[PDB]
Structures are given as structure tokens and as C-alpha cells.
Amino acid sequence: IANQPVVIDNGSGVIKAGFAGDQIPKYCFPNYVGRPKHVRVMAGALEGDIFIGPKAEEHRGLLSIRYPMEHGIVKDWNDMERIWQYVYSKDQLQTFSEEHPVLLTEAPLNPRKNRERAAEVFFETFNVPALFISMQAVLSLYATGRTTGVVLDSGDGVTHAVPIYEGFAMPHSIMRIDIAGRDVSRFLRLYLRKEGYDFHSSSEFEIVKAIKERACYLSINPQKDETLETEKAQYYLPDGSTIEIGPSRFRAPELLFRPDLIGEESEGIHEVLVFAIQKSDMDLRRTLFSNIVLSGGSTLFKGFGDRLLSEVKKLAPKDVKIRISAPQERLYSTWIGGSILASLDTFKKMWVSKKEYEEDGARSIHRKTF
Amino acid sequence: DVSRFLRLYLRKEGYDFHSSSEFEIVKAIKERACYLSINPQKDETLETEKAQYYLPDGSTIEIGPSRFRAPELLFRPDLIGEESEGIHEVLVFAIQKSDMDLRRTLFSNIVLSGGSTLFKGFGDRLLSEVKKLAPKDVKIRISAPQERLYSTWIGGSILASLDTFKKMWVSKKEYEEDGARSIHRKTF
Amino acid sequence: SDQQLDCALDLMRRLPPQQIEKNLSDLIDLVPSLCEDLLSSVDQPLKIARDKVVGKDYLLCDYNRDGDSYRSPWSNKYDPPLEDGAMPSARLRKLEVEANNAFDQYRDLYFEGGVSSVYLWDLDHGFAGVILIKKAGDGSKKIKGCWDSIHVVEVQEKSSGRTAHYKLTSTVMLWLQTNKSGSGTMNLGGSLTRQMEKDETVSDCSPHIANIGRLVEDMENKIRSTLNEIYFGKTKDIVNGLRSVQTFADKSKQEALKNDLVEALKRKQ
Amino acid sequence: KIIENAENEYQTAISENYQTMSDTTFKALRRQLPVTRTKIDWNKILSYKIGKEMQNA
Numbered sequence: 010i011a012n013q014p015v016v017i018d019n020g021s022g023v024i025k026a027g028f029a030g031d032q033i034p035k036y037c038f039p040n041y042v043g044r045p046k047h048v049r050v051m052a053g054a055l056e057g058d059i060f061i062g063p064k065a066e067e068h069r070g071l072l073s074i075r076y077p078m079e080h081g082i083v084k085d086w087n088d089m090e091r092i093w094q095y096v097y098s099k100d101q102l103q104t105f106s107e108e109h110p111v112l113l114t115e116a117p118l119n120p121r122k123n124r125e126r127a128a129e130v131f132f133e134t135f136n137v138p139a140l141f142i143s144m145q146a147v148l149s150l151y152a153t154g155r156t157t158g159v160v161l162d163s164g165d166g167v168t169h170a171v172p173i174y175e176g177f178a179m180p181h182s183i184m185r186i187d188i189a190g191r192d193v194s195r196f197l198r199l200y201l202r203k204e205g206y207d208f209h210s211s212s213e214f215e216i217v218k219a220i221k222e223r224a225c226y227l228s229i230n231p232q233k234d235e236t237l238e239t240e241k242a243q244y245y246l247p248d249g250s251t252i253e254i255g256p257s258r259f260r261a262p263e264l265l266f267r268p269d270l271i272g273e274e275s276e277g278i279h280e281v282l283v284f285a286i287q288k289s290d291m292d293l294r295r296t297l298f299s300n301i302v303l304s305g306g307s308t309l310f311k312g313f314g315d316r317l318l319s320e321v322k323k324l325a326p327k328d329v330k331i332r333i334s335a336p337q338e339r340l341y342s343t344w345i346g347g348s349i350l351a352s353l354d355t356f357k358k359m360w361v362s363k364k365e366y367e368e369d370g371a372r373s374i375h376r377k378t379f
Numbered sequence: 380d381v382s383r384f385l386r387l388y389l390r391k392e393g394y395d396f397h398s399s400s401e402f403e404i405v406k407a408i409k410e411r412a413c414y415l416s417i418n419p420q421k422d423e424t425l426e427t428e429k430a431q432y433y434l435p436d437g438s439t440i441e442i443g444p445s446r447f448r449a450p451e452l453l454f455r456p457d458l459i460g461e462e463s464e465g466i467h468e469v470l471v472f473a474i475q476k477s478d479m480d481l482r483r484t485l486f487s488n489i490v491l492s493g494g495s496t497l498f499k500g501f502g503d504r505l506l507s508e509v510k511k512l513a514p515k516d517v518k519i520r521i522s523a524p525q526e527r528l529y530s531t532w533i534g535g536s537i538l539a540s541l542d543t544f545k546k547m548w549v550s551k552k553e554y555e556e557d558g559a560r561s562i563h564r565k566t567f
Numbered sequence: 568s569d570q571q572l573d574c575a576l577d578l579m580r581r582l583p584p585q586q587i588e589k590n591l592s593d594l595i596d597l598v599p600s601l602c603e604d605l606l607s608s609v610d611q612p613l614k615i616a617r618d619k620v621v622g623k624d625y626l627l628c629d630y631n632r633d634g635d636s637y638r639s640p641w642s643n644k645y646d647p648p649l650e651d652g653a654m655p656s657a658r659l660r661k662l663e664v665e666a667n668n669a670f671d672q673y674r675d676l677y678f679e680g681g682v683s684s685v686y687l688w689d690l691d692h693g694f695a696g697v698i699l700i701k702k703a704g705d706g707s708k709k710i711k712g713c714w715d716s717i718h719v720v721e722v723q724e725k726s727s728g729r730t731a732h733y734k735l736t737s738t739v740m741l742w743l744q745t746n747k748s749g750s751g752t753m754n755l756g757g758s759l760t761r762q763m764e765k766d767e768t769v770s771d772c773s774p775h776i777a778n779i780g781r782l783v784e785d786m787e788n789k790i791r792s793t794l795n796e797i798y799f800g801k802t803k804d805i806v807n808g809l810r811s812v813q814t815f816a817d818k819s820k821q822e823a824l825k826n827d828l829v830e831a832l833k834r835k836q
Numbered sequence: 837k838i839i840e841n842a843e844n845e846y847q848t849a850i851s852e853n854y855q856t857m858s859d860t861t862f863k864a865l866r867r868q869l870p871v872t873r874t875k876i877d878w879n880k881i882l883s884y885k886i887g888k889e890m891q892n893a
């Protein structure tokens with residue numbers, strides 16, 4: 010069909026949607042469904058029990074927040090289907106799903122049953138012409154314009170590192186860990202409660218995320234800043250009330266390098282990057298250390314690169330060149346790559362048509378998916 | 380919160396206790412007359428006897444359905460409007476957070492404490508609620524000591540009696556030297 | 568015979584790790600002149616002895632051995648008995664037994680059973696020692712395994728500043744057997760050796776045992792992760808390299824589409 | 837076809853054993869953390885060992 014393919018980046022934090030060829034995602038909204046907790050008494054009050062995107066952000070206080078996706082895995086499908094209906098609605102893209110093909114960008118090492126169930130939605134519920142699922146890491150390098158390189162994509166839901174050689178992703182060298190941005194936000198809330206600031210409500214947890222995003226830096230030396238008495242840095246809440254954040258600024262983000270803080274038996278983000286390179290063949294290890302690409306929202310912490318670069322050099326072999334490159338638009342890397350892939354004529358052969366799905370079934374996605 | 384939550388029902392029934400001195404009578408009423416219904420809706424639908432309570436002055440108040448509707452807050456925080464988990468969810472959720480090897484032992488060894496556990500039928504209501512939230516085919520043994528209120532103090536008496544206690548506490552001299560650090564070092 | 572010693576050590580690396588005791592004995596009988604070098608150089612499984620004085624099982628090292636007799640760290644006695652009196656100090660006996668108590672709780676938490684023995688000897692600069700940890704899999708349980716670890720530590724105590732230099736060498740030897748009906752009888756052996764050097768602050772708040780304790784567990788964690796991820800991963804990759812379940816004909820179809828993409832990417836420049 | 841099925845199940849079972857060993861046998865010999873899911877506090881153990889022996893008796 011002549012119609013441009015729609016790129017849908019189903020992220021845990023924010024979903025990035027737009028047409029192939031577009032330089033930036035036109036339609037980016039938070040990935041959760043807000044339902045009103047308060048009772049409607051007056052006539053002429055706000056209509057609907059479902060609010061998505063800017064309508065939910067404006068009247069957030071009325072709503073109870075519930076994210077359908079956890080660690081990049083759709084927990085509630087009923088809500089996820091309604092969000093994709095919102096992606097096509099008059100507020101977002103405003104187009105028929107039957108007219109435009111779809112390009113999905115999922116995390117690596119996900120269950121097969123999820124892709125199978127996701128495919129059912131776009132072929133049965135939506136009569137989509139063709140669906141192709143692609144890796145986030147491979148597209149991230151396509152956006153950067155590099156064929157060989159390591160993509161350390163620390164998202165809100167999941168953190169993974171994929172070493173990719175001349176476009177190809179080595180499936181044995183992929184390392185994936187559940188600990189991500191949302192776990193640091195939970196850890197900050199726990200530490201602020203010990204300081205004596207309570208944020209019990211799901212709406213108030215969004216303020217805790219806003220506090221982290223605005224005022225949170227990663228210390229170069231953790232034990233130095235941990236021991237030293239910290240300046241009580243005040244933050245102004247939406248209502249007007251002032252809270253002293255103080256040491257919680259740098260102690261919260263440490264979770265990424267020390268997973269035992271929350272109590273998870275996993276490797277640190279700096280260990281994941283180095284191990285992923287070391288698993289690769291001797292010839293490529295020096296090039297993978299030379300070409301390191303940062304991605305994901307959880308790398309946006311102040312002084313993240315300085316701390317990570319120090320840890321990589323300590324874990325990495327002696328006399329190895331460690332060059333870590335950060336694109337300014339870290340968040341948009343996955344989507345931009347998808348737009349580039351979708352614009353190619355080779356993409357027509359790559360995706361699975363509706364007719365092909367009906368004949369073979371789930372097999373058609375597994376055969377043609379990379 | 381149960382005493383303040385009961386006060387809300389007494390005012391709606393037509394019994395006012397505005398004063399801080401009067402709230403202590405509501406607290407005494409709460410401790411005296413409150414039952415945890417095994418089936419909430421069944422006792423809500425049935426017409427109560429409206430049992431009378433004698434106030435200090437001599438006046439009688441008819442508590443009625445407010446008796447068992449007030450203490451429900453512990454199991455349903457939605458009633459006061461706080462978006463928290465119920466007391467029965469806290470117990471099961473706290474065990475489910477622990478490692479697989481201990482969960483079975485933790486379900487086997489459950490100890491009830493605190494003053495708000497003294498409500499009549501707390502054990503039978505909690506056990507039923509735990510069954511709904513708990514995993515299938517798990518044995519649940521909830522142990523409630525007769526001296527629930529004094530369990531924390533009696534523990535302190537035993538710990539203090541142990542010779543190790545001489546090493547455990549912080550001396551006045553150690554506090555003067557290290558300061559706030561002293562109690563943080565020999566506590567944590 | 569220096570060339571035979573190299574050949575003997577190089578062979579032992581390739582021979583099965585369970586047959587090291589029998590295979591080492593044969594090499595010693597062929598070249599008995601290099602018996603001391605072969606025994607010292609080649610890593611051997613840890614022997615266990617029962618101390619009848621304290622009633623505790625202790626692991627045997629080279630340091631506690633005075634001639635033929637081995638010293639038990641709990642009793643501080645040589646079996647068979649000797650009157651040499653090689654105990655370096657009385658303060659060492661207090662620190663050594665306290666150290667054993669520290670790593671006795673450690674093994675009960677992490678390993679849950681087994682044996683741990685801490686041997687300290689004093690030196691002119693600062694005390695050194697070895698920490699032996701051994702954990703055996705349950706016989707009745709289908710799963711069979713054997714954990715061996717040797718943590719050699721040398722502490723160089725500075726005159727002023729109280730910032731001793733901690734030199735740790737760790738040699739781990741792991742046996743694994745999986746008797747799953749699906750696979751058959753899988754046996755995956757391995758051995759790793761690493762070294763770490765740090766300069767921790769020594770005090771009443773931060774004693775020698777606390778400074779060493781953190782370094783010992785940190786090395787075990789790195790080795791545990793590296794073995795399970797890097798070495799056990801590479802092993803799986805080679806097995807999948809030998810045979811494929813998917814037909815190559817079907818693989819070449821996907822490769823042709825991937826190759827066509829790569830050409831279309833290099834094309835559009 | 838009998839060879840194909842038997843060798844496919846054998847290779848599949850070896851792949852399953854790698855995941856199984858990480859979760860069972862390998863962790864069973866040495867845990868990543870104690871049952872408490874915390875790192876050992878060496879300063880606390882030196883004083884606590886004495887306190888816990890009398891408090892747990």
C-alpha cells in the first residue's frame with residue numbers, strides 16, 4: 010500500500026509513535042491508563058472513565074494511575090489494546106490501522122508467547138496489512154549511523170546491552186537485567202519516607218519521579234559523598250509545600266551500579282557492559298570497547314558517563330581504549346531507527362502480510378522476524 | 380484511625396463527641412463495643428439489636444450497625460479514602476517478597492501482635508482473608524500469644540537479662556566521644 | 568628435568584579435574600626428582616581431618632604442616648603431636664580463632680554447611696594466612712557437586728596512617744553433575760584463579776577481619792558471575808556450533824534477506 | 837526421523853540444563869546472597885554473633 014508505515018515504540022515509560030520518514034516522533038505520551046477514583050455528583054462533569062495522554066496529565070488528581078507494562082512486558086492486555094486504539098484515534102495519529110503497515114520495536118530476550126499474542130491483536134482485532142517486529146538495539150545503531158557497536162539501552166522498564174557487528178546482533182552476547190529506571194523511583198520513595206516525606210498515592214509517586222528527573226546526580230565516588238554531610242537541597246511540590254531532598258539525590262541512583270541496595274541478585278550496569286563485550290570473539294572485543302553507544306532514559310542522570318567510564322576501565326582489561334559515545338537524543342534513538350528501516354524498499358519483503366499470518370499462523374512471524 | 384473513623388459513624392447516627400476529653404470516651408466505646416464480621420455484607424443487610432452503652436454522665440447511646448462497620452477499615456482502607464493495601468494483604472505480600480526457601484516456614488510461623496489485634500473474631504476473619512490472598516495448597520498456622528500487648532516489653536526484659544546485653548548497649552562515655560555515630564555504629 | 572616439569576603441568580591442565588590425584592601420582596613416579604615442584608605447583612583437592620580435642624572438622628593446608636604433622640586451628644595442636652612450638656604469638660591465636668568464627672557464620676549464610684579453616688602466620692612487615700572453604704553436594708539428592716576455594720592473603724601493616732596493603736589470591740575448583748532423564752548424565756567441570764590488591768583503613772570500627780572479609784566475598788562474587796556467564800556461556804555456544812536443530816537451508820533464506828538489507832544500507836549513503 | 841527427534845531432544849535438554857544449573861545446582865553450592873537477600877555486614881557479625889547465640893537460645 011502507498012500509505013507510509015507507522016512506527017510504534019511500545020516503551021514502559023513513554024510510547025513514541027509516528028510515520029516513516031519523520032525526523033522526530035510527532036506523538037509521545039506516557040504508557041499508563043488513568044481511571045477516576047472520585048465519584049461524579051454534578052451534571053456537566055468530565056465525561057469518560059478512561060483518560061490517556063494530555064487529558065490524564067491535566068486532571069491527574071482525579072485519576073488512579075496503573076501502568077499496563079512492567080519490565081517491557083504487557084501485564085494487562087485489555088488496557089494495552091485500548092492504548093493502541095488511542096494511538097490511531099483523532100487525538101493521536103488519526104488514521105485507519107487497515108491502511109498503514111506497523112513496525113514494533115521490542116526489547117531482546119522477551120517471551121515468544123508475547124509476540125504471538127501481540128500479533129493476534131494487529132491481525133484479528135485490527136485488520137493491519139502487514140506487521141514486522143524488530144530489535145531496539147539494531148535500529149538504535151541505524152539512527153546513530155554505525156554498523157558495528159555496543160548499545161547499552163537502560164530504559165524505565167528493562168536495561169539490556171547488545172553487541173552488534175556490521176548490522177548483525179550476536180544472540181549469545183546479549184545481557185538483560187530487570188533492574189531499570191522505575192526501580193530507582195521506587196527506591197527513592199522508600200528513602201524519602203525514611204527522611205520523613207510520605208507519598209502513598211499512585212499520583213504522588215509521579216511527583217517522586219519528577220523530583221528524580223529534576224534534581225538527581227550520580228556521584229563519581231559513592232563512599233566519599235555517603236560519609237560526608239550533604240547540603241539540604243529544597244524541592245517545591247506542585248501545591249507549594251517545600252521538602253528537603255538532601256543526600257537522597259546521589260544515594261538513590263547508585264542502585265544501577267549496586268543492585269543489592271534494593272535486594273536483587275543481579276550484576277551492576279557497568280559489569281553488564283564489560284561482560285557482554287568479553288563474551289564476543291577476541292578480534293571484535295577491542296572494536297566493541299572502542300565503539301560503546303549509550304541509550305535509554307535512565308542514563309540521563311547528571312555525571313552518569315563519568316562514573317560509568319571509571320567503572321568500565323576498572324572491570325575492562327589493562328591497556329584497552331574505552332570510548333563511550335552518547336547521542337544528544339538518547340530517548341528517540343529506537344524510533345528514529347524504525348523510521349529509517351520502514352522507509353527502505355527491502356522492508357516490503359521483511360514484514361508478514363495479514364494473508365500469510367492466516368495461512369501459517371504464529372509460524373509466519375517467527376520465520377520472518379529477525 | 381479506627382477511633383476517629385468510629386466517631387464519623389456516631390455523628391451520622393446522631394451522637395456528638397467534639398471535645399478531646401469526649402474523644403477518649405469514643406476510644407473507650409471503640410475498645411468496648413466493636414466486632415469483626417466474618418461476612419461484611421450479611422451483617423450490613425441484617426437488622427442489628429442496637430445494643431445500648433452507658434456513658435460516664437449516665438446517658439445511654441444505641442451503637443447499632445456502626446459497631447462492626449467502623450473496624451472494617453483495617454481490611455478495607457478504601458473506606459477512609461487512603462490508596463493502601465489491607466492488613467491481610469500486608470501479611471501475605473510481605474511473605475511473597477521473601478525468597479522461595481523461607482516462604483513455607485514464614486507461612487508456618489505467623490505471630491500476631493499490637494493492640495488492634497484484640498478485636499473479637501480477628502483470627503477467624505484474618506485466616507479467611509489470608510486463604511483468598513495466599514497461594515493454593517499452603518499450610519497457614521497463625522500463633523497469637525494471650526499477652527499480645529506486653530510481647531514487646533517481655534522481649535526487652537529477656538534481652539536485657541542476657542549477659543551479651545553488656546556488649547550490646549552504648550555507654551555514656553562512648554556517646555560523648557563519637558556522638559551520634561556511636562548509636563549508629565553499635566545499633567546498625 | 569625442567570622440560571618434563573612443563574610437560575607434566577601442561578598435561579594436568581588437559582586431563583580430567585576429578586582424576587588429578589591419581590594422574591599426579593603417576594607423573595611423580597615417572598619424574599620423582601620434581602615431586603616437590605609438581606605437588607606445590609599443581610592445584611589438588613582439599614583433604615579434611617577430624618580434630619578429637621575440640622571435636623571439629625578442619626581443612627588441611629601447606630602452612631599448618633610442620634614436617635609430617637598438621638596443626639588444627641581450633642585446638643592450636645599438631646597431629647601427630649610435636650614439641651617444636653612454632654606458634655608465632657599468643658595474640659595470633661586470639662585473632663585466628665576470632666577470624667574462623669567470622670567466616671564460620673559467613674559459610675552458614677552463603678553455603679549453608681561445609682567446612683572453613685583460617686590459618687594466620689606472623690611476618691616482619693605484617694601477618695599472612697590462607698582461608699580454605701569446602702562444600703559437598705548431598706549424596707541422597709540427584710544433584711552431585713564439589714566446591715573448593717583457597718584464599719591466600721598477605722597484609723603489609725603501615726607504620727603510621729593505619730592503611731595496610733591487602734594482597735588476595737583466590738583459586739576456585741568447581742565440579743558439577745546433572746542426572747536429568749532428558750539430557751542423560753551431564754558433567755561440567757571448571758577451575759579459575761584471580762588476584763586483587765587494595766589499601767583499606769584499619770581501626771577498632773574497621774578491623775583486619777572486616778577489611779579481609781569484604782575482599783574475600785567480593786572475589787568469590789566476581790568468580791561466581793564470570794564462570795556462570797562467560798565460561799559456561801561460551802561452552803553452550805560451541806555445543807550449538809557443533810549441531811543445529813534448524814536446517815541451514817532455512818537459515819540461508821533469513822541470511823539472504825539480512826545480507827540484502829546490509830547491501831541496501833551501504834547502498835543508501 | 838528417529839535420529840532427528842532423539843538428537844533434537846538431547847541438544848534441547850543440554851540448553852535447558854544451562855538455565856537449570858544457574859538457578860538450582862550452581863546457586864545451591866554457593867548462593868549469590870544469604871536467605872535474607874543482604875550482603876554480610878562484617879562489623880555487625882563480630883558483635884552480633886555473641887548477641888544472636890544468647891538471644892536465639
Ligand SMILES: Nc1ncnc2c1ncn2[C@@H]1O[C@H](COP(=O)(O)OP(=O)(O)O)[C@@H](O)[C@H]1O
Binds near residue numbers: 021221305310311
Ligand atoms: N532527566 C532525567 N534524568 C534521570 N532519569 C530520567 C530523566 N528523564 C527521564 N528519566 C527516567 O527515564 C525514564 C524514561 O525511560 P524511556 O526512555 O521512556 O524508556 P523505554 O525504553 O522503556 O521507552 C523515566 O520514566 C525516568 O525514570
